[PDB]
Amino acid sequence: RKGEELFTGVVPILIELDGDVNGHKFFVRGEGEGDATIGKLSLKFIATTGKLPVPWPTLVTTLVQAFSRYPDHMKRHDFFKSAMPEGYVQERTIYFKDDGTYKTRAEVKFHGDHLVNRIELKGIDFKEDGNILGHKLEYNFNSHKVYITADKQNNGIKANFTIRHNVEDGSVQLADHYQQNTPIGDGPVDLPDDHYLSTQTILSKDLNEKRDHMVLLEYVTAAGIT
């Protein structure tokens, strides 16, 4: 009924993102399931507003680290599940090198028996024919490490990491992420020692789906504490 107890089996997920990049407005809805005992997420996302103005891979990090697999010996370092069901606010600034910036604010919490991630995203200062609004990024997403640290001042957790997006010409587009998470409720939460999350992500399509969409499968495991 609280915290890690809510994640002992498969949990259904709803995601909603309201976005605006250089004034291009869009809306994304995602649905599927997560299982934190194995660290597995399975989700399908649809743009309801027509063709997205940015590449799907640039939205992956924004679109529920509560589904990370924390090994038994690291369970006291799992902030994300400890904040549940009331949830947490997740905020980022994402700097695309030599291009624009996204700022995001999300609330991740339970809604009934479902976990929901509700997001607002604003992007500014993008190049219209750059790698992002020019759609020059490959449809894939490579493995990354996200180091997590406690943010005691605020009873939450911070992370800083750089996503490397492959570009169609063989170059790499860097996206520097700054993240802060805050609990929504004022019950106690776990504040972790430094550790990281290891992620893999594979992106695919539904050949029967006519809307602009992304099918995603991810495995994530926490590590770095022995």
Question: What residue ranges bind Cu ion (CB under 5 A)?
Answer: 12
Nearest alpha carbon to residue 65 among 36, 37, 38: 36
Output 12 or 50, the one with its CB closest to Cu ion.
12
Output 12 or 187, the one with its CB closest to Cu ion.
12
Query: Integer distance in angstroms from the first to the last C-alpha of the chain?
Result: 28
Residue 178 contact among Br ion, Cu ion, none, beta carbon within 5 to 8 Å by kind = Br ion
Report, in Å, the least distance between residue 112 CB and Cu ion: 5
Amino acid present at 120:
E
Output 42 or 180, the one with its CB closest to Br ion.
180
Report, in Å, the least distance between residue 44 CB and Cu ion: 13
Report, in Å, the least distance between residue 181 CB and Br ion: 10
CA distance 177 to 106: 15
Amino acid present at 108:
V
Report, in Å, the least distance between residue 100 CB and Cu ion: 34
Output 165 or 177, the one with its CB closest to Br ion.
177
Question: With contact defined as beta carbons under 8 Å apart, do 160 and 62 qualify?
Answer: no
Residue 12 contact among Br ion, Cu ion, none, beta carbon within 5 to 8 Å by kind = Cu ion
Q: Which residues bind Br ion (CB under 5 A)?
A: 91, 93, 178, 180
Nearest alpha carbon to residue 41 among 214, 223, 181: 214
Assign 7 to helix, strand or coil: helix
Residue 93 contact among Cu ion, Br ion, none, beta carbon within 5 to 8 Å by kind = Br ion
183: which strand partners?
88
